[model samples]
Target: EGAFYTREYRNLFKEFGYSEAEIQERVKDTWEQLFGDNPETKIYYEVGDDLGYLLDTGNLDVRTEGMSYGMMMAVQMDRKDIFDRIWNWTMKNMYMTEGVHAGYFAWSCQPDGTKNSWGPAPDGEEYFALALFFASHRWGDGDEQPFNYSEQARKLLHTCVHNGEGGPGHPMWNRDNKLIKFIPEVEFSDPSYHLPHFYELFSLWANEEDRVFWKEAAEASREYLKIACHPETGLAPEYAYYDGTPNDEKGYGHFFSCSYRVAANIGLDAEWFGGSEWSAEEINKIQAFFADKEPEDYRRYKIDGEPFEEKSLHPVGLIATNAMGSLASVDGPYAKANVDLFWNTPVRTGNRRYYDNCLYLFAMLALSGNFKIWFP
Candidate 1:
């Protein structure tokens, strides 16, 4: 929870129309809780002080994720104080000189800004790049500094793609950029699945050929997800080798791991050439399989044999499934079931409000093209 953000919760901001003054005050309240009134609080927190507390309390990965989230929010709201604080903190704290290829950002860091992990973990970094790109594109005035930073990321990413670094078989790149390594799969955490987003980013920043390369990377990711989807349970596993071997001792059942599957699947669906409803149908079938499974069967899930609780994260998969409904319409009931789950369940985390429902609410507003519909 260290790195969690309220972006998903920001639909509320768009709805209630809080004055700029009120919004800043609310941000301050949460910031104080997370960082204890330090002047450097801006460096660590994006929103909601409790998450900052989690970051400080040794939830290193969460901190990284939260930092990216905060950066995104800062960029979104044009909050220079928040954006620069997170950006500077991440650079000083997470930079790795050796390991995980070409000195990619390490996943976590100590409060003192020392390297806690020397791996090119991809989740937050991809989001970080996208956020930076978004900020520069939307707000920066073509200045040299932020432009330089963004260009640096683009150049490094170009090398990663051309060098054939960090692919399906070779998920981890060498720290020194010598050779790609085929590392053992880790559940819910891996660098390979995330690099594709960088390719897409590269396309945006570079030429048409670069766009094609990014699109190819996205297609390759879809291939990876397709392989991960289990035929028996219609569920993707938590860990699998590049060739599709189950790495988990009990084989491929982990909640957080499954969440990545949903993330990966969503990535696929969002891509331009990503095939039609086939993937969505498969996802609906999988979720339906889960919903239909008896509670006792849920007990037998994964290696730990525990069923995943209903949550907001999974609804992204369901949301995609519904989006597919417009195309296929075959799995209407299954897709609707996910929509129902998404809207009704209250997200317990991040403001203890209802994140689980917010994204779906936006979906409705998006569909209707009526901002007022959401508020009323």
Candidate 2:
């Protein structure tokens, strides 16, 4: 299918001259490394017959982030069993029933299903909604409430935009501007959370009346990302104001762990939708910033291209995302080099392996054209 993918969207890996056979092998190898018995980078944990969890090893807890990501990977790989197990565990343990956050999943939990935080993360909710939608389209929903994947997805999205209408909590989005909030109660936004690709799909699949909101959200996010990312380096602040300027309240104004996804998300958006006018240029800028730096030298940096001496807590993950960004950046001078670096880098081991390996797998799937939308 090299550059000739007949699907609605482009197959970026093929367009970039990667052989189909090589793409398949790379994806297969990555899945095994993360989901198989590769004790080092494997994060999936089976619990009895019907439940499984993706452990956040560094925090020694389970997170909605990891669980939803696992479901996405499973659905993309056509592994219904793994997808169901993770979803079941999530519904059973993380779902909040009666609180300000009702209808949302607790962002963090213990390995044995104890709640670590009652607060919800909007990023996790977004991922959960998209993964459920994909699951519903790929495999028909079950007979129950939570297991009814499409219904579950619709409900979550409805609540995300309308939670405070008749309740005590705030909605997950800034209704006036149609942009997602960093959290339901916050005024700022997380750059990594602007997933226009997911929002575009939501515009079509979310509840009838709310579909328009999602469409506007997709456009808002696309425009917001252009402002949030630096013009020269493509580095984004972890948090930014509604006007698209960095929010340095907690010193999160720099490009760090959370900002890495901006590149990865942009790549997917360009792949799923035709590349936006700014997509290729944004990715190219990012690749150029890291072109001369090795992972060992990766450090925190201001979005303006000034580096700090602080070593990156997740350099391996950063490399993974940079490589994934190349999917939308064929014209980037350093695009191929970024991919080469990622292919040579091993999945991070030890405590922080959770974030690193999760990103690693995503980059693998994305570059191989295995990360796809499952249409009904």
The stretch of ten residues in a row with the least summed lDDT in candidate 2 is 1-10
Q: Which number leads on TM-score?
A: 2
Tens-digit lDDT track of model 1 for 171-252: 3333232222232133332222433434444556644445666666655555665565565544545555555444565544
Best by lDDT: 2
Model 2 spans with C-alpha error above 4 angstroms:
1-19
Q: Candidate 1 — which residues are off by over 4 angstroms?
A: 1-63, 73-81, 98-102, 141-149, 162-198, 206-212, 249-268, 271-275, 293-300, 303-331, 349-376
| Model 2 residue 139 lDDT score | 89
Clashes of 1: 7
TM-score of each: 0.60, 0.96
Residue 207 lDDT in model 2? Answer: 98
lDDT of each: 0.43, 0.89
Model 2 TM-score, 2 decimals: 0.96
